[PDB]
């Protein structure tokens, strides 16, 4: 089968993606009990108005822990560093014909319901191929999900240039946890669990800075009322 | 004792708006017994950081509610009505001088550290008398403040032009509220209420209006995880 | 955007109001259990003939209290105080386009059923936009509503002039009562308040007649069965 | 912001890094139970003469296991492969400068309290920045450590060249083990395990010797006693 065309130009975009920036991983452990009660309340606290998934609230996380530490919201430009004061976020949607990465702009200090609407919108958008180059082309930092195939324990991605960092959110899934009851003698509870995976480029961010990012994401997922901070 | 002059200018003031301006009043009460609640936990899970207020809390769901009807969020003009979209918010403070409201930008979106720290920042400065004309004229909508003082149960307050409508919040107090037990009989439990005073420009606002505009900010307040939305 | 034009004349208006016409306000608190049960029960022993509401039952109450005070159902004009002898009562309703006052005439002595039924036709004509200027030009006193929003405990309102007087009813509420038991002991009961605001007209009326009015108000309110009377 | 020009060396470096040698990575699980026990009882029959942790124990081990094990402790020269015999460890240290690789020498019989001696020497001389070119050019094998981050679980490096190899050490964690109790049924044990990662290069290692030496590695810390050894 002759190659479509497309593909050559993905396929050369990740070649100059991998030749010129060396990628280096980290994977973590969240813990989202608390943030699915969450989830359950608001969407139970309605009438139909809105429906909220995990995705949007790593999104406002994301851009909190990129506030907190603005050298990941960077870039690498011709002899200069570029920095950027907001987030973007580019999300990934897989289409028939492929993938596609559309934009969310101005996320820190926006609302979870604009955010939910705003996906919606550009997702359905992308399923009936009615884009504009700007709302695709851009962007500081990115994300892909693929929480509904549950087989999926972790995952890598790809650095989509120019930018400086990509995340990644396995499947949740059941493990093991101590707990103390009110004797002294320690229990087994059962908690919910997904694995996190940052690729990170190595000319820009540090090790050092990439696990103070992931800490303060894990910080925040963790206590979920932090996000109105 | 003649009089300072500065007086005169907010006499002036004063009269100009109560004379350009007709005024009507909106009296509701609130539940705070889950707000306090949060601003504990939020402060014992902090390492000094920050530290937090109910007026910030307020000003927040004060920015939501003006989103949610932005007929609010307007003033009055020559033959035109202005309208804005982000929430100025001018807060009061008590000097020796006399009196003096400072603003802060762009509430909506802004996160509540950010206005507690803006908030001290501009209370300090205006107990030194060290602001600038623009940091206190301007904004959309006003807000005045006697938590401190527990004898007040409720006030009025006056219309800061051109603005069109203000808000005041009295102190909090115990009130007897029923409750269902386990069993089919009802009981006595007491919740931390507090009233709360909202004046209108009526040349703008109507009493539906009013009555939304304070329907929303009950809603968002006594279901205060509402806010990140 | 520019005014509508129709705005203009409204604001004028109540700017002559509260120019030409002093306000002071009476705030009071009613105790509806009975009445609510005599309305159940009279909606319960009909064949879907009519259907009542507490506004009926206030607009009656206001008839009879005006005219055991006939101070009250009076007017300011040139140089002349303007007494009646019939009750011409003025109901807001609250269209899109603003605020309407149709007028009901000759309550006192007329029948709530007959009352409902003017109501509903006046409010559905004032939906369409299908009145003469006489069913909301002229009326004795004045009435607004805001029952079906259970935020609000009270509200002022604006005298529409000529008029010496208005009412406010706020919603429903629950609040602590005292009772005696069958013993010596005292006991909590829980009765349905409502607030009700008068505002009045200073030139003619005074705090103690105002007073007297709601006097008899609650007296009617709290015994219905002198609503027969 | 330009660049201090210091970053390029160090982008250059790791491009050539990745650009010649491929990468391949493995990733195993430790127990420290025994471990932690034991530099527990080593610190208390102590007079503050040393101090020890965690990455001194793992610098042995990585000797031990480098010398029952040769062919990782190699490189890559101009068609020739360079075997040394002692083991020098590169230990990162992280600076607001940016990131530093001092060198131990002779750790295969040196002494876990030479050891930390050196490696505190070392860290606090290039906090100050009072190194020499020599104590950080050179060296066989290197390592990376994150363990006072609780948050990180695992994580990739890349290989400094023209070294072979490199560890990453994860932070401690809770698991869940079996255990059998005098009885036949198993129980529930609470292990603390630590996630290691390690990258080679392919030309010189394949995954068998790679997994022995991951294997050696495993047996020494499991069984600390074979440090002696």
Excluded: C
């Excluded at 976020?89 to 993938?99: I, R």
């Amino acid at each position: 089968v002759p190659i479509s065309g497309m593909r050559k130009t993905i396929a050369a975009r990740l070649k100059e993606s991998v030749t010129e920036n060396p990628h280096f991983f980290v994977s973590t452990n969240l813990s989202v009990s608390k943030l699915l009660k969450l989830r359950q309340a608001l969407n139970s606290s309605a009438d139909g108005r809105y429906k909220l998934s995990v995705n949007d609230f790593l999104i406002k996380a994301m851009g909190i822990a990129s506030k907190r530490v603005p050298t990941v919201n960077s870039s690498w430009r011709d002899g200069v560093i570029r920095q950027f004061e907001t987030v973007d976020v580019s999300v990934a949607v897989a289409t028939p014909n492929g993938l596609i990465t559309p934009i969310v702009k101005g996320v820190e200090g926006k609302g979870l319901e604009s955010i939910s609407a705003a996906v919606k919108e550009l997702a359905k958008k992308a399923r009936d191929g009615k884009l504009k180059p700007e709302e695709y082309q851009g962007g500081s930092i990115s994300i892909s999900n693929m929480g509904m195939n549950p087989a999926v324990q972790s995952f890598t991605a790809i650095i989509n240039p120019p930018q400086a960092a990509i995340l990644a959110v396995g499947a949740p899934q059941k493990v093991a946890v101590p707990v103390e009851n009110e004797d002294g003698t320690t229990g087994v509870s059962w908690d919910e669990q997904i694995i996190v995976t940052a690729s990170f480029d190595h000319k820009v961010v540090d090790g050092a800075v990439g696990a103070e990012w992931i800490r303060e994401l894990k910080k925040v997922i963790e206590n979920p009322l932090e996000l109105l901070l």
